[PDB]
């Protein structure tokens, strides 16, 4: 395992990673010191002799340079020590171990490598500073973030090895994945957030900014689109300027809930010939979604065009947002005086439901359903009332939040946060659970020595009435910490356990491959499937389609 199946290798490099709005999807930012340590062995041909001479002349310390010149016999000339290091008249057939240069294919990776998308080929872009820079929309396959993460780079040392990386492993080739027959890369964070904000019917742009936004798109035709508005001032909509980033012959149709071709809510999506007709652009259109812009553009225009679409959208949106601004403060967690009153009463009614049920259980009136205990029946009821309360209180909070609420804004775009988050920060944290039950009696007949014995009340068994805004009481604080711990303990287990599963799965199926007869066979030549997937289709070239003859009435079918 440690020496044959895996081993430490030369032409490898490692560092802390950083994001780069100004980097192409298929690129990787290489620190100059790394580009200078890592080399490629280039043969001296008439097609490169001039460039190689200059690189040898630059030597190992100036960037587009080289260390080592290998001649016939195989003798390595050390460019940092040789007395003839400034002489060297190259000959064809010699090799120059040149520095890693812009556009070289490199294998970029983040451990754990659970995916083939965890190990992809990028185009080198030599940069100042000591981190590896990467396009934000490649963060997901690697499952990378910039909180201290490190990544590894591998350098192909052969022409065929570079072809393998560029023709099989390249980032654009991986956009649409066979794992879930859909893209594994999409518009995220700031870009996902600003693309929504830009797309509002209300969002309008003036000439000055429009011109700058248009120029920010490298594939731009140079033609200024006619402004949506031509009356007191030419005014372009956000949808208009973002459509410049979308190539022609791109068609997309959606329909969410109330979408009606006149799209009252500006929901759904309609793109004709790469021009957005209606529909606020968010996660459903521009994320890792099944039939979105990205799945469509890859299939329609191709992987190379799709990888440009990442940058193009990033460039416009990042610029517009840089100029617009986006924040979040304590004020975004605050709901109305009246909302709070309603939340407060929502909880007190839940508190009474639990009392009534308790009083009833204690009177021997509560009958247990077939299959479950009277006490199990009680616990089930209490927890429902208590969960209902958190959900009802939370929904009360969410409704009160204005469209200008920054938390609500991030939820609408689908960039960060869900309902729970709003509810727990603004309304009520809710019931704490350990081993799927409410807080257990760790002391005799009580959860804490601040309670009396035999107390089944919400507060007693871990119900956090307060929100993170209001703040938690010591009892509530401790119980939340108990619930919290169960999470960290299984996180720690559901990593070492899943890692072992993954190994076993990989080892058992290692040798299964598609043969020249469309058959699925192991190393013995034994048949697993007669046709791969039963249809002999590649998973990355497949998408969810409606079978129109199956549904509807017999009359509808006839019509």
């Amino acid at each position: 395992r440690g020496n044959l199946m895996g081993k430490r290798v030369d032409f490898s490099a490692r560092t802390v990673i950083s994001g780069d709005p100004n980097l192409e999807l298929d690129q990787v930012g290489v620190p100059k010191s790394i580009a200078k340590t890592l080399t490629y062995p280039e043969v001296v041909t008439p097609y490169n002799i001039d460039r190689l001479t200059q690189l040898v002349r630059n030597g190992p310390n100036e960037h587009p340079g080289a260390k080592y010149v290998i001649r016939d016999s195989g003798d390595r000339i050390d460019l940092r020590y040789s007395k003839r290091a400034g002489d060297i008249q190259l000959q064809y057939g010699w090799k120059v171990e040149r520095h890693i240069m812009d556009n070289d294919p490199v294998l970029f990776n983040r451990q754990p490598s659970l995916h083939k998308m965890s190990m992809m080929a990028h185009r080198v872009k030599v940069i100042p500073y000591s981190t590896f820079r990467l396009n934000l929309s490649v963060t997901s396959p690697y499952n990378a973030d910039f909180d201290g993460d490190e990544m590894n780079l591998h350098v192909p040392q052969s022409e065929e090895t570079r072809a393998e990386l560029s023709q099989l492993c390249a980032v654009p080739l991986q956009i649409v994945s066979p794992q879930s027959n859909k893209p594994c890369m999409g518009i995220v964070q700031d870009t996902l957030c600003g693309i929504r904000k830009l797309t509002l019917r209300d969002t309008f742009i003036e000439l000055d900014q429009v011109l700058n936004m248009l120029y920010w798109v490298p594939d731009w035709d140079g033609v200024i689109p006619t402004p949506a508005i031509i009356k007191p001032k030419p005014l372009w909509s956000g949808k208009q300027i973002l459509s410049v980033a979308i190539p022609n012959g791109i068609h997309l149709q959606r329909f969410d809930e109330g979408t009606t071709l006149l799209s009252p809510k500006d929901n759904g999506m309609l793109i004709i010939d790469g021009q957005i007709i209606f529909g606020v652009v968010e996660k459903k259109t521009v994320g890792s979604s099944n039939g979105g812009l990205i799945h469509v553009v890859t299939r329609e225009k191709g992987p190379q065009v799709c990888a440009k679409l990442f940058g193009n959208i990033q460039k416009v949106v990042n610029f517009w947002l840089l100029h617009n601004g986006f924040s979040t403060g304590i004020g975004d967690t605050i709901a109305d005086g009246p909302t709070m009153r309603e939340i407060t009463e929502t909880i007190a009614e839940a508190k009474k439901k639990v009392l009534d049920v308790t009083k009833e259980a204690q009177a021997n009136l509560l009958t247990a359903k077939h299959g479950m205990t009277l006490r199990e029946s009680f616990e089930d009821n209490v927890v429902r009332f208590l969960n209902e309360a958190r959900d009802k209180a939370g929904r009360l909070a969410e409704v009160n939040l204005k469209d200008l609420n920054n938390v609500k804004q991030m939820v609408m775009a689908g960039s960060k946060g869900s309902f729970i988050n709003i509810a727990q920060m603004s309304a009520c944290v809710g019931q704490q659970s350990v081993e799927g039950k409410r807080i257990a009696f760790g002391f005799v007949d009580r959860t804490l020595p601040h309670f009396s014995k035999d107390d089944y009340s919400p507060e007693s068994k871990g119900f956090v009435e307060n929100s993170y805004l209001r703040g938690l009481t010591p009892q509530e604080f401790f119980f939340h910490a108990m619930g919290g711990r169960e999470g960290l303990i299984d996180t720690a287990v559901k990593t070492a356990e899943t890692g072992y599963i993954q190994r076993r799965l990989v080892k058992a199926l290692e040798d299964i491959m598609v043969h020249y007869d469309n058959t699925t066979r192991n190393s013995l030549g034994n048949v697993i499937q007669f046709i791969y997937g039963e249809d002999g289709m590649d998973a990355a070239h497949i998408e969810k389609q409606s079978l129109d003859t199956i549904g509807g009435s017999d009359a509808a079918f006839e019509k």
């Binding site: 043969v43 097609y47 064809y92 065929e160 570079r162 072809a163 023709q167 099989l168 020249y516």
Partner: protein
């Protein structure tokens, strides 16, 4: 022994992604090593971009030997293989 004749070939008339990559790689290696070029390079210098051109104009003189699980093979020329992809 073993071999399938040209007439009786049942494998895809299409070049696989794995075939194209290995083809382009092998040819790139040759060009990189001062081997003769079968097409007019129009300001082209990268061995791979040249192999891509030789592939596009069907001037790669290589043959893919397709092994079937019993051991029999189907010889297909780069010349005959359709390049969709």
């Amino acid at each position: 022994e073993k071999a399938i004749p040209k007439d009786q070939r049942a494998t895809t008339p299409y070049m696989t992604k794995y075939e194209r990559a290995r083809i382009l790689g092998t040819r790139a290696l040759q060009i990189s090593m001062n081997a003769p070029v079968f097409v007019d390079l129009e300001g082209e210098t990268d061995p791979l971009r040249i192999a891509m051109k030789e592939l596009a104009e069907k001037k790669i003189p290589l043959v893919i030997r397709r092994y079937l699980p019993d051991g029999s093979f189907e010889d297909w020329s780069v010349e005959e293989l359709i390049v969709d992809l």
